[PDB]
């Protein structure tokens, strides 16, 4: 279109045209906006646009155009400043400084173009980072001087200094080299005495609110690093905690400053310092009570109303109080005259903790945890806080969340502490709360759920006798509450809360068998209830109680004729008749927990056989039927039956582990034959219908059978104790059933769960089956690698499981890679490096660990032909491939492990652990050390990959890096320094002497 004219640099820049593009972008819409956007990005990215920046800044009337001009200048200053002729550098500085002065002198511009002035201030700071103080020693003196001639200039100078402090102390770690950061930190520290004087004078004298606020904003940044004497040996704390807490325009920033003061490095000896720390807290709290709101105010209501900046203020007040009191409350706990202050501050926190705001509640709760833990352990403290703690009990009980998971655990911990501190008070609050559920004054589904969670959360805190009375009272009252209510909906809610509380008090259940049996039988009744959620609740409570009370199901209880587990198995068909499949499996898993408590082998195996009677009979039947007619496996009903049988076995094996072997032996051979039959059917369907067959319900049901078979074998082998049987009985039939099927299926039909199953086998018994591991590699390695080496996205599960398998083979049976033919071992190396390049952490991490373990495996072989050829063939491949991901800015998540691998590789040469020349006889003179050749290779590699670096930069980087290859922390710092320098031109090569 027409707007593209600004991209033609042969002609002069038409500013009026620039603004039509800029206005169209910022104020336009639709297609026009999108076009101007692409034009502006192209204009901005022109490496010569900076030359046209002073034109835009001088003659444009559009603030956005001048902003973009400064962004263009920013790119130049931060990346290519040092390549410029010195004249341009002086010129650029001059017309940035001059522009800032002019904008500050025009009051209309100063107040209406804040964004543009702030951008100019940051651009100035970028120049200071390049030039100051070595080429600009008068900046700070001249800044302080200019401040006196104009309130506007003085206010803006506070903005510049704020940004300078941020760039030097807050955001330098990853953006500057260590040496440059230290240089600028020292320079600011050298001249801060003058800076502080100006800042204090402004605060003590100034009357312009905007100037005061800017000065306080800069002070907030200083408090991150300045020595404490500037705060405690001046009168600044008085000003902050009194004057500036009264006016709302300075209140927010002042409170943030005082929060950071509460974190300064302060001597713990001086009693006058402690007095000053007490004093500014006293002053702040007094100003809050007189100028903002009294202690009694309803902060919950104020926050909910959301007037003005009330929400941010209450957030900041919570941060101030919690920060100060976590560090300094002991200062207030001994002196009688400070007791009211201590308790008023905690009362504000009580009121803040009633606010309905999740993230703010977590902030106050973190503090309460700190307090009640100290009251639990510290002598002679808990009595000070009795009234605070009593209120807190109610707050936490009334805001209990659903057992969100982290928040519940935090709430439980505080409430447990609070219960120990006063068990009587806790119990009375909870019983009262329950009364107000029964009398209806506070009744609701939410309120009864919350109270039940709180009651259940303190299990274990009371004596068993007190707990007995308490549990009986709560359950009686809850039982009456359920009878009282009408409608399934209300009764279901209460009945579920009853079961929740019961399941939280296993000590009670263990001591009262007759009650425990009644509970279980009631849960079995609820398993026939169709009301939404009841059956899930009944099964979840059942397995939860079993996990804790299993012993009382496996013994024969007094007055009973058999262990209750027998009774459960006798009626299992009736009990579960109405459950969905997932719920039946939970039931069987719970039975397996109990059965594994029986350590009589013959009794345990008998219980196991009886539990599995129904699935085993269903299994025997459709092993006969399925065999006589493989068509059945196309019947969705038979497929679903089979999958649920296997899922039942998985559930029981999950809880019984090693004890499951007799049941596995009952089905194992017929199960693997089924795996083959299913496999043939899947292949036949894909052949008859195409790859789309894998999406059909029929094939998905068939593949579920295969996946559950693999999961069952996985589950048992991962828990097996007799590994001789795993090797002699299980592995060979397994590999024969799964490996060829995987290799010879088309990619879209290969189950990634095969790889996962093989990983478990290798992990558990890999050391005992070296020929089996070779067979695994032969069947899955090349064909899986070909699935995943064309892009980083296809076959995501195979990708992850593939490198998990290679990793465990490399750990447990490294000899299998030694048997690979040279061509396949080369693919192995390619596969490892390919993993480096993934952004997917589930692949990149394993790729780097395999590489590290492989180098270690090679090193362990000593001076032998395979190790020597490995270094000759692959050492520099790994060095260069690791360097590539380290420096390409697209794998920052792997930096730590990339650095470790690189340091290991370099240390091999540094320690002469490689016995052959890494070079060829013709490359370098005879006798050249691998050390020298490594440095030459790396120097040449970096020169071609980063041609804008000087030879001196590269040599100094490599000298430091190799010297530091036994010091990972320092090694990583030098790598980070290199990553900074490659982003710019003219980096200082002495930076790499920082550690030395």
């Amino acid at each position: 279109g027409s707007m593209e004219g600004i991209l033609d640099f042969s002609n002069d820049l038409d500013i009026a045209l620039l603004d039509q593009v800029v206005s169209t972008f910022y104020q336009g819409s639709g297609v026009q906006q999108k076009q101007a956007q692409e034009i502006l990005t192209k204009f901005q990215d022109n490496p010569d646009a900076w030359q046209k920046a002073d034109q835009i800044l001088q003659f444009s009337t559009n603030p956005q155009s001048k902003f973009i001009a400064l962004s263009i200048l920013d790119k130049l200053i931060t990346r290519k400043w040092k390549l410029l002729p010195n004249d341009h550098r002086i010129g650029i500085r001059n017309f940035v400084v001059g522009m800032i002065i002019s904008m500050c002198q025009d009051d209309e511009v100063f107040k209406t173009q804040k964004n543009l002035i702030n951008k100019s201030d940051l651009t100035l700071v970028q120049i200071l980072k390049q030039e100051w103080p070595q080429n600009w020693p008068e900046f700070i003196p001249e800044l302080i001087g200019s401040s006196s001639s104009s309130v506007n200039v003085c206010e803006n100078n506070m903005i510049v200094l704020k940004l300078l402090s941020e760039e030097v102390f807050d955001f330098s770690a990853e953006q500057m080299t260590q040496a440059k950061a230290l240089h600028l930190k020292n320079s600011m520290s050298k001249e801060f005495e003058q800076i502080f004087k100006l800042c204090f004078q402004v605060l003590e004298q100034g009357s312009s609110s905007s100037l005061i606020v800017a000065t306080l904003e800069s002070l907030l940044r200083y408090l991150h690093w300045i020595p404490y004497r500037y705060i405690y040996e001046t009168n600044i704390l008085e000003l902050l905690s009194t004057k500036f807490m009264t006016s709302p325009d300075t209140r927010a920033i002042t409170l943030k400053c005082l929060t950071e003061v509460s974190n300064l490095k302060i001597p713990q000896d001086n009693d006058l310092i402690k007095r000053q720390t007490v004093l500014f807290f006293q002053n702040t709290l007094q100003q809050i009570a007189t100028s903002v709101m009294p202690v009694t105010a309803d902060l919950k209501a104020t926050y909910a109303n959301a007037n003005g900046n009330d929400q941010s203020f209450l957030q900041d007040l919570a941060m101030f109080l919690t920060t100060y009191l976590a560090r300094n409350r002991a200062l207030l706990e001994s002196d009688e005259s400070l007791r009211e202050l201590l308790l008023n501050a905690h009362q504000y926190l009580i009121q803040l903790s009633k606010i309905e705001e999740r993230e703010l509640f977590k902030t106050t709760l973190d503090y309460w945890h700190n307090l009640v833990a100290d009251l639990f352990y510290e002598p002679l403290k808990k009595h000070i806080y009795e009234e605070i703690c009593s209120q807190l009990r109610l707050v936490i009980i009334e805001n209990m969340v659903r057992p969100t998971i982290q928040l519940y655990k935090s709430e439980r911990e505080v409430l447990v502490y609070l219960t120990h501190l006063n068990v009587i008070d806790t119990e009375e609050i909870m019983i009262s709360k329950l009364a107000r559920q029964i009398d209806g004054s506070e009744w609701s589904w939410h309120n009864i759920n919350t109270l039940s969670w709180a009651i259940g959360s303190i299990s274990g805190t009371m004596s068993e006798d007190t707990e007995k009375r308490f549990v009986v009272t709560v359950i009686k009252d809850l039982l009456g509450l359920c009878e009282q209510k009408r409608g399934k909906d209300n009764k279901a809610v209460v009945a579920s809360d009853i079961m929740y509380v019961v399941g939280q008090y296993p000590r009670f259940l263990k001591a009262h068998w007759n009650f425990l049996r009644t509970v279980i039988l009631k849960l079995f009744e609820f398993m026939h209830e169709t009301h939404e959620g009841v059956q899930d609740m009944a099964c979840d409570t059942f397995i939860k109680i079993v996990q804790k009370c299993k012993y009382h199901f496996v013994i024969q209880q007094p007055r009973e004729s058999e262990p209750f587990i027998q009774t459960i198995i006798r009626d299992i068909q009736k009990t579960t008749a109405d459950l969905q499949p997932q719920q039946v499996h939970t039931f069987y898993k719970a039975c397996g927990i109990i059965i594994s408590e029986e350590r009589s082998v013959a009794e345990r195996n008998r219980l196991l056989s009886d539990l599995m009677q129904l699935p085993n009979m269903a299994w025997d039947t459709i092993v006969e039927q399925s065999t006589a007619n493989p068509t059945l496996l196309l019947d969705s009903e038979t497929v679903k039956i089979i999958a649920n049988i296997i899922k039942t076995n998985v559930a029981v094996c999950t809880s019984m582990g090693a004890d499951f072997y007799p049941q596995l032996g009952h089905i194992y051979y017929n199960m693997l034959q089924l795996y083959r039959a299913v496999s043939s059917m899947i292949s036949a369907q894909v052949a008859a219908e195409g790859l789309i067959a894998t999406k059909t319900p029929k094939v998905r049901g068939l593949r579920t059978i295969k996946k559950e078979i693999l999961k069952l074998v996985e589950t048992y082998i991962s828990k097996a104790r007799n590994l001789d049987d795993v090797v002699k009985v299980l592995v060979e039939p397994l590999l024969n059933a799964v490996l060829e099927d995987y290799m010879n299926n088309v990619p879209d039909a290969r189950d990634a769960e095969v790889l996962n199953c093989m990983t478990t086998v290798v992990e558990k018994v890999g050391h005992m089956i070296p020929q089996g591991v070779i067979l695994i590699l032969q069947s899955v390695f090349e064909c899986t690698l070909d699935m995943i080496n064309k892009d980083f996205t296809e076959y995501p599960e195979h990708r992850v499981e593939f490198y998990k398998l290679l990793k465990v083979i490399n750990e447990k049976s490294f000899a299998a890679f030694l048997e690979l033919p040279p061509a396949a071992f080369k693919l192995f190396v390619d596969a490892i490096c390919w993993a480096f390049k993934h952004n997917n952490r589930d692949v990149e991490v394993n790729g780097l660990q395999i590489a590290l373990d492989l180098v270690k495996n090679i090193e362990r072989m000593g001076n032998v032909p395979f190790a020597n050829e490995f270094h000759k063939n692959y050492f520099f491949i790994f060095v260069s491939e690791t360097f590539f991901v380290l420096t390409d800015s697209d794998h920052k998540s792997g930096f730590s492990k990339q650095a470790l691998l690189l340091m290991k590789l370099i240390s091999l040469v540094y320690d002469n652990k490689i016995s052959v020349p890494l070079y060829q006889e013709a490359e370098v003179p005879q006798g050249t050390s691998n050390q020298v050749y490594l440095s030459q290779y790396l120097a040449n590699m970096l020169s071609n990959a980063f041609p804008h670096l000087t030879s001196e930069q590269i040599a100094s980087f490599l000298s430091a890096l190799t010297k530091q290859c036994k010091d990972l922390v320092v090694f990583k710092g030098t790598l980070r320094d290199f990553l900074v320098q490659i982003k710019e031109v003219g980096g200082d090569p002495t930076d790499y002497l920082f550690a030395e």
């Binding site: 009986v472 509970v519 009631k522």
Partner: peptide
């Protein structure tokens, strides 16, 4: 006996009017 009273009551727990 207080546990036995409560247990008897628990045995009649029900969710339908």
């Amino acid at each position: 006996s207080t546990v036995d009273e409560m247990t008897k009551k628990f045995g009649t727990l029900t969710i339908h009017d």
